[PDB]
Amino acid sequence: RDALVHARLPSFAIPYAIDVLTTGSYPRLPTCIRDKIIPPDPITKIEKQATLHQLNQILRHRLVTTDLPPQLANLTVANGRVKFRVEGEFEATLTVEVPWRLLKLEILVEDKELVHSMQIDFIHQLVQSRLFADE
Amino acid sequence: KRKEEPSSIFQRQRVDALLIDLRQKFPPRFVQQKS
C-alpha cells in the first residue's frame, strides 16, 4: 500500500498528449491575460483588402434596397468606400440591421478672403444621430 | 504635430450663426446606447 507505483496503470492524457504533439505553445490554458489587457492585432493585417469586395457588395445591396434620393449626377459606388455625392460642395461617406459610418470628406468653398475650420463636426454629430435614427 | 494651432478666421464666422438653424429644423436623437 506504499510502493505499488510499479502496479499503477499508465496515464493516457489524450488531450494534453494531442496538444503537445504538434502545438508547441500553451493553447490548453487561459490565454486572456496578455490579450485582454493589450491591443494586439488579431487578424486582417493586409488580408482586409479581400473584405472590400463584400463591403462593396453590401453597400450596393443596401443602395438597391433603400429608396435612393434624387440623382444630382453625384451618385457613385466603388472600392474602399461609397462616394455619397460630389455635386457642388457635397461630401462623401460610407460604413466600414447594419451600422453606418461617416466622416470621410467635408464641404468645399471658393472665393477665399483660408476656409472655415473643422467646427463642422457638430453637424456630423447630428449626422451620427441621423445614422442612429435609421428613418 | 498640429494639436494647439487653432486657425481663426472671423470673416465667415457668421457660419456659427447659421449653425443654430439645423437643430431647429430637425434636432438630433439621443441614443444612450454605446454599442
Binding site: Q119 | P6, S8, I9, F10, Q13, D16, L19, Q32, K34
Partner: peptide, 19 residues
C-alpha cells in the same frame, strides 16, 4: 452615455490679434 447636456462653448475660437 456620452453627454446629457447642450454644448456650444467648447469651440471657443480665440482672437489673440489685439492691435
Amino acid at each position: 452615455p456620452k453627454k446629457k447636456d447642450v454644448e456650444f462653448l467648447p469651440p471657443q475660437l480665440p482672437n489673440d490679434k489685439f492691435k
